[PDB]
Amino acid sequence: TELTKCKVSHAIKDIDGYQGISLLEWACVLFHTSGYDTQAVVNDNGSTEYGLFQISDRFWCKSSEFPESENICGISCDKLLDDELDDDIACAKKILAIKGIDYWKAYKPMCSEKLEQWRCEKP
Amino acid sequence: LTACPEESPLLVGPMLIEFNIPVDLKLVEQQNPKVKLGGRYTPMDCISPHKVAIIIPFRNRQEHLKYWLYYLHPILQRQQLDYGIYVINQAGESMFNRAKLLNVGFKEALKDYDYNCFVFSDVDLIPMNDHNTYRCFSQPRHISVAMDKFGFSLPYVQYFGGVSALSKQQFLSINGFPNNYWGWGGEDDDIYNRLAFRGMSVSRPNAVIGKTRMIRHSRDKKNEPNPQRFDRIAHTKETMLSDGLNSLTYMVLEVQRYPLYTKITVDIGTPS
Numbered sequence A: 001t002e003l004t005k006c007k008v009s010h011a012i013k014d015i016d017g018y019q020g021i022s023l024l025e026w027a028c029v030l031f032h033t034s035g036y037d038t039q040a041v042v043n044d045n046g047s048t049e050y051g052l053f054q055i056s057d058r059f060w061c062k063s064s065e066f067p068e069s070e071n072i073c074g075i076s077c078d079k080l081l082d083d084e085l086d087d088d089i090a091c092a093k094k095i096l097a098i099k100g101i102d103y104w105k106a107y108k109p110m111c112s113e114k115l116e117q118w119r120c121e122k123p
Numbered sequence B: 001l002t003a004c005p006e007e008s009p010l011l012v013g014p015m016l017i018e019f020n021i022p023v024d025l026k027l028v029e030q031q032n033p034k035v036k037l038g039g040r041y042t043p044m045d046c047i048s049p050h051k052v053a054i055i056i057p058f059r060n061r062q063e064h065l066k067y068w069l070y071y072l073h074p075i076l077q078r079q080q081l082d083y084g085i086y087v088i089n090q091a092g093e094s095m096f097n098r099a100k101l102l103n104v105g106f107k108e109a110l111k112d113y114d115y116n117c118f119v120f121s122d123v124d125l126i127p128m129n130d131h132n133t134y135r136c137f138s139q140p141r142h143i144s145v146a147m148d149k150f151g152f153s154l155p156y157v158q159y160f161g162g163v164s165a166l167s168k169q170q171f172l173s174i175n176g177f178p179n180n181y182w183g184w185g186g187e188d189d190d191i192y193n194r195l196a197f198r199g200m201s202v203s204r205p206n207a208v209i210g211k212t213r214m215i216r217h218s219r220d221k222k223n224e225p226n227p228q229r230f231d232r233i234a235h236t237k238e239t240m241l242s243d244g245l246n247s248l249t250y251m252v253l254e255v256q257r258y259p260l261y262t263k264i265t266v267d268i269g270t271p272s
């Protein structure tokens, strides 16, 4: 599903401030990462990235194309293609703790300034 | 004849834009008898200071082109522009290169007429309000500011994709657009970066008059997300000097003059 910035912001609250990344920064990162499409699937040099957070099967989740993946998140990549964001968020937190925000290539170039526009005022 | 008024008296404002009824160019031509071979139109009632080349990057989207022509020709005539329509068709099977095709359109259009303004438009975007003028302004103009795709709003303030317009001087000033972006994404952000580096700001109409419809379509396997896009946009300040109008090379395979437009099929090479 193609979510809105506010739908996304409300769903990822538990991630706010984790590893020092705010909700504004995440709204910005997710728009440029998947266009807020929970079913996004992108290939990238022999590997596939899934969902809202574009979590890769290279190390993070297990896919049928690449079954011996480290599957660090301990989850099937298909669980990242639905609208229940709790496990997508749990896996993102593992990426943040282990690898850091730079796993998301959109962060530095697109989310280093003009963060206010990303605020959701809708309760 | 004297100068066309600042605002056209022919505008109707909001329009219904639907992609239901199939189009027939023969009919479009029938309805637009004033459009000359190659899709050129010049007002007869007044003199327009806007000599506009409208550049459409393109690859296998004829059904989209039909709708684009069906809606834009009447709009552009109402806007009282001295314009020409150019469809830059990418031959080959390499990933789609939107920016490079726009650069080719700039160079090729200039061979036909002394255009002073260039509108760069995706072939699937139709403006829903004719007060959203397809011409150039004192600063770079972003036109498709409220696309239905983004809920009829601007997705981010730095967004310069979709439909935009640059005067010839503005375009020249940034060394045109990058040629090195292959595949989907980031080339428009690179363009945005260029304008900013040259000290320009982005002019836009408000979100109401900027309402724009996007014809729907399935993913283009020939235009998948560019893996290098995020890195590339971080180096625009330096690369805009060596990648642009000044390094543009390509081969023209065919120039086709149809009654509603000029289609130029080109071979723009492969990822370097």
Ligand SMILES: CC(=O)N[C@@H]1[C@@H](O)[C@H](O)[C@@H](CO)O[C@H]1O
Pocket: A031, A032, A033, A035, B155, B161, B162, B184, B185, B186, B187, B188, B189, B229, B230, B233
């Ligand atoms: C670096 C990148 O991917 N930028 C894309 C841009 O090319 C596109 O026009 C816009 C709307 O879809 O979304 C951005 O995220």
Ligand SMILES: [Ca+2]
Pocket: A079, A080, A081, A082, A083, A084, A085, A086, A087, A088
């Ligand atoms: Ca999920």
